[PDB]
Amino acid sequence: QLLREYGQFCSKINQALHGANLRQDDSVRNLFASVKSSQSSPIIPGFG
Amino acid sequence: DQLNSSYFKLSIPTNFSFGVTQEYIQTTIQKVTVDCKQYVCNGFQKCE
Phi/psi for A17 (5° steps) reads -65, -40
| Residue A16 contacts residue A9 (beta carbons within 8 Å) | no
Residues A32 and B4: their CA atoms lie apart, in Å, by 32
Residues B26 and B28: their CA atoms lie apart, in Å, by 6
B15 contact A CB<8A? no
How many other CB atoms sit within 10 Å of the CB of residue A36? 7
| Residue B9 contacts residue B3 (beta carbons within 8 Å) | yes
Phi/psi for A44 (5° steps) reads -130, 155
B2, B3, B15: best to mutate for the A interface, most A CBs within 10 A: B2
CA distances from B4 to A5, A44, B11, B21, B39 (A): 76, 13, 17, 40, 79
DSSP summary character for residue B46: T
B11 contact A CB<8A? yes
